[PDB]
Design a binder for these strands. Structure first.
Length: 105
DNA sequence: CCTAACTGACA
DNA sequence: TGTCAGTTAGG
């Protein structure tokens, strides 16, 4: 039967409302309503740039300058960079770098 | 280039 | 259980 695979439909529609109600710090409970997409699955879709709580402004200049600096000293510490960078959680700035800025300017 | 999607290791 | 560091997948 259908299980795992891409994350959408009865996936976002759940975490999307459950996060705005509880918050991204109860993945253990959030998971219970996602049927099989438990524990980590919910976190995977989220904590990146999905959070409707942060409009998809994306990288351009005022943010593209972050990786160029933040990574230059704390790149391998995406967790703290992300914390000091509201919006792009510990995943957006991580994959962005290793795809877009994969040249360590 | 851009976000999404997951795994292994760690706190 | 959640986070932390890196890699993978589709558009």
């Amino acid at each position: 039967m259908l299980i795992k695979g891409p994350w959408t439909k009865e996936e976002d529609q759940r975490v999307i409302k459950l996060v705005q109600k509880y918050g991204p710090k109860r993945w253990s409970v959030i998971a219970k309503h996602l049927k099989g997409r438990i524990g980590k699955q919910c976190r995977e879709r989220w904590h990146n740039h999905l959070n409707p709580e942060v409009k998809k402004t994306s990288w351009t200049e005022e943010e593209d300058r972050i990786i160029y600096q933040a990574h230059k000293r704390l790149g391998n510490r995406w967790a703290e960079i992300a914390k000091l960078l509201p919006g792009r959680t510990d995943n957006a700035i991580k994959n962005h770098w290793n795809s877009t800025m994969r040249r360590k300017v």
